[PDB]
Amino acid sequence: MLIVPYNLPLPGGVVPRMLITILGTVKPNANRIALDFQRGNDVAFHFNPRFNENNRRVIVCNTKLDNNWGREERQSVFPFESGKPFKIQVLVEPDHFKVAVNDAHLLQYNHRVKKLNEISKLGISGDIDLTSASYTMI
Numbered sequence: 204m205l206i207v208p209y210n211l212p213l214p215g216g217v218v219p220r221m222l223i224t225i226l227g228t229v230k231p232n233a234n235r236i237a238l239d240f241q242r243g244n245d246v247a248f249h250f251n252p253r254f255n256e257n258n259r260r261v262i263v264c265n266t267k268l269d270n271n272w273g274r275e276e277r278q279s280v281f282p283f284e285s286g287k288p289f290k291i292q293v294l295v296e297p298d299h300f301k302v303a304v305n306d307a308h309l310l311q312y313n314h315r316v317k318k319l320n321e322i323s324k325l326g327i328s329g330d331i332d333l334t335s336a337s338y339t340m341i
């Protein structure tokens with residue numbers, strides 16, 4: 204379906220009520236996936252499933268400013284499975300990105316990058332077959 208890494212333009216950046224939906228399948232023996240909501244070279248929101256970080260599965264979220272990664276936000280819930288189809292929904296709310304996987308809420312990430320309308324690309328990378336990536340306003 205789509206070539207990874209895939210770039211989805213976000214025209215005029217993001218705004219509350221914007222919903223991004225990603226459909227794909229995790230490859231066998233996946234190691235990593237990443238979503239990168241980019242403001243130029245900066246990464247406003249990096250969402251990064253790691254399948255084998257010291258034999259644990261964890262989602263790492265962070266922001267990259269002037270080429271430097273900030274303080275990571277980790278929680279324990281890991282809804283992805285090697286080999287299986289998934290849906291990721293990222294809903295922009297006024298104070299955070301809200302993420303649900305497979306229709307179940309996963310996590311929130313508070314806005315560190317304040318200029319939402321300059322967050323103008325979403326990169327999708329890692330160990331998936333990517334079916335589709337799109338957005339709508341709810």
Ligand SMILES: OC[C@H]1O[C@@H](Sc2cccc(Cl)c2)[C@H](O)[C@@H](n2cc(-c3cc(F)c(F)c(F)c3)nn2)[C@H]1O
Pocket residue numbers: 235236237249251263264265272273274275328329330
């Ligand atoms: O905090 C989050 C960051 O963690 C560092 S490690 C680190 C080093 C120094 C300081 C800090 Cl705070 C962290 C990683 O190197 C970063 N990273 C992952 C990817 C990547 C690329 C791909 F192509 C993928 F497919 C993929 F899934 C992921 N690109 N950059 C990022 O995850």
Ligand SMILES: [Cl-]
Pocket residue numbers: 204205206209
């Ligand atoms: Cl493509």
Ligand SMILES: [Cl-]
Pocket residue numbers: 241242243321322323324
């Ligand atoms: Cl951008």
Ligand SMILES: [Cl-]
Pocket residue numbers: 317318319320321
């Ligand atoms: Cl804005």
Ligand SMILES: [Cl-]
Pocket residue numbers: 207208327328329330
């Ligand atoms: Cl990739």
